[PDB]
Every structure is written in C-alpha cells, then in structure tokens.
C-alpha cells in the first residue's frame, strides 16, 4: 500500500530534522564557542607572555590605587582585566623597544590606552576608574610602580597566571594615590 511510505518518510522527517537542529546548537554554542574561547586564551600564552608579566603586575598595583584597602570584587576584576590586557596587547604591538629594556614607556603607553579604553566603555564610574587613571598620569606617581622591589618580579620567570596580589609588594603610603589625594586637599583647603 501507499500508507507505509507515509509511515516511513514521516518518521524519517520527524527524527532526522529535530536532531539536525539540536546538534547544530550543541555544536555552535557548546563546542565551537567554548573551543574558540580556548585558543584565544592560548594565544595570550604562546605570544604576549612577557608583557602580561609586566601587565598583570601593573594591574595589581592599579587596583590597589583605585580601591585602596577596601574589598575588591574578585568577579569584575575579570571584566576589567580583559580590558587591561587588551590595552597591553595594543601597546606592545606598537613598540619596537623591549619591555624589560625600557619599562616606563609602556606605563605611559598602557595607562593612557586604558585611560581612554575605560572611558569609551565604562559609562558610570562609582569607583572613579577613569578619573583616578587621569590623576596617575597627571601627577606621574606611576614611577613608583617601576622600582627596585618591582623590577625583580618583571624580570623573574613567573607566568602571568602565577602573579597574585600577594606576589606584588605594596607601595609605601607616601606613594599611593589616596595619600596624594588627601595631602592635596589638605594643602588646597
């Protein structure tokens, strides 16, 4: 009869077509988008491993300058470390000079890159991230981020994943922005 073709070619359709659509979403969102996430996490390790030693180190100091002994969020560092890493990736492709050979050229390059990269992304700054990086450039107190305790970490062979806030020693209180902003208001008032 002709009812078996209506029995067979329908079940051929109702089985092949939903599963071809479910595998498509399992492939694109469950395989391919996590897979593409992995290689571009690897591409910051095969290249760029020398800058991110100096980059994550200058970011650990910068989070201490923005916040200054208050509880930092461990989760939205990760939103802002990616923007800080994209500042150093953008600067190190623009410099023929080495990072270890001339380090403050990068601090003027990286901080000004994320003085504007934060300004084009962060609309509201309750912690004043663009505003404080303005005054670190404008008052040149980022010269303490490159000092004799700090040049030892950036020369040493530590991968950037190993660099924690504990490995970076704290700046003296006379060097940080919080005492700079307090001593300013004392003088001007």
């Amino acid at each position: 009869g002709y009812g078996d073709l209506a029995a067979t070619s329908a079940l051929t359709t109702v089985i092949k077509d939903p599963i071809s659509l479910t595998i498509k979403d399992i492939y694109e969102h469950g395989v391919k988008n996590p897979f593409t996430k992995i290689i571009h996490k690897l591409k910051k390790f095969i290249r760029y491993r020398k800058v991110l030693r100096w980059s994550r180190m200058w970011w650990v100091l910068l989070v201490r300058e923005i916040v200054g002994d208050n509880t930092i969020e461990k989760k939205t560092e990760k939103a802002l470390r990616e923007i800080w890493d994209q500042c150093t990736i953008a600067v190190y492709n623009n410099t023929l000079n080495a990072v270890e050979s001339k380090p403050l050229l990068f601090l003027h390059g990286i901080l000004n890159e994320c003085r504007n990269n934060f300004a084009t992304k962060l609309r509201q700054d309750p912690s004043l991230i663009v505003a404080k990086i303005d005054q670190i450039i404008k008052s040149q107190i980022y010269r303490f981020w490159v000092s004799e305790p700090y040049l030892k970490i950036g020369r040493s062979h530590t991968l950037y994943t190993h660099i924690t806030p504990d490995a970076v020693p704290q700046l003296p209180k006379e060097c940080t922005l919080k005492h700079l902003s307090s001593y300013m208001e004392e003088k001007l008032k």
Partner: protein
C-alpha cells in the same frame, strides 16, 4: 553617653578603647542632620559619568578577543569628538582646569564611599559593621580604631 559629647572628649581625656559597645554603635550611626530635610544640591560636574562612553560594539569585542595582532583597542571616535568640542566652544570660554581641586576632592570622597555631589553622611563597611561618614566629619580616628583593633575580635 550622648552621641555629640563623646567626640569633644576624644581630644581631651579619654581614648577610643574604653567606649561602650552601645557608644561605639552610636558614634558610627549618622548624626541628627541625617533625617533633616534639605532638598538642594549644586555643582553637577561629576567625574562618575563619562560623556565619551559608548555601547559595546560586539564586532570590535569579537575582534579584540581573538588577539588579532592589532594596534588599537578602543573606538576613539567619541573621545576625539570630545577633544574637538573642547578646543572650539571652550577656547572662546577660555581654558578651565577642573583638576586643580574638584578632581582630588571627588577622588577622596570615593575612598570614603561618598558620591561626588553628596553633601550628607555616607556608610562604608569597616570590618563587620558600617560607619556613616561624610565630607565634613570624616571620622578618620574611628576608621583607624575599627580596622586595627577589630582585626581578630568583634564589636558592634
């Protein structure tokens, strides 16, 4: 025993260690000026909002994420637009600084948990409990007390 009188005695005779639990709780609560109605604020030039900011591009963020051996991260259209309009309608009105003093006041307020135009008393979590400070009474000697001495033990 009263909120107002104890801070007049902190310079003279008694230190911070000998206060009662109910006295340390009262000195961290806001004053009587809090709850008193005063609907006026001024100088709406805050460093909290950035006028140069824009949306996530979602094509640039895709391009910057793949590490792409690129040379610039941000978009630089709206931040050159603000540089151009500063040089044209500003040079008539000649230069302004806004950093000689209005920057460092608003930065120090952000370390105390205070918004930029906020003239009233603002909380900040010190240890386990909150301390209401303002621009006017910074309560800095309490913050030295409840950070140093309250590392290991508990106070309310």
């Amino acid at each position: 025993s009263v909120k107002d009188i104890k801070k007049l005695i902190e310079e003279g005779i008694l230190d911070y260690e000998d206060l009662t639990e109910n006295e340390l709780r009262k000195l961290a609560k806001p004053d009587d000026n809090f709850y008193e109605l005063s609907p006026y604020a001024s100088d709406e030039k805050d460093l909290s909002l950035n006028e140069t900011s824009g949306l996530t591009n979602e094509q640039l963020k895709n391009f910057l994420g793949q590490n792409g051996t690129y040379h610039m991260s941000y978009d630089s259209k709206s931040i050159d637009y603000a540089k151009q309009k500063k040089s044209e309608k500003k040079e008539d009105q000649q230069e302004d600084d806004d950093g000689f003093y209005d920057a460092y006041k608003q930065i120090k307020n952000s370390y105390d948990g205070i918004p930029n135009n906020f003239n009233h008393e603002a909380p900040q979590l010190i240890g386990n409990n909150y301390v209401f400070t303002s621009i006017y009474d910074t309560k800095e000697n309490l913050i030295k007390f409840l950070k140093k001495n309250s590392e290991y033990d508990l106070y309310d």
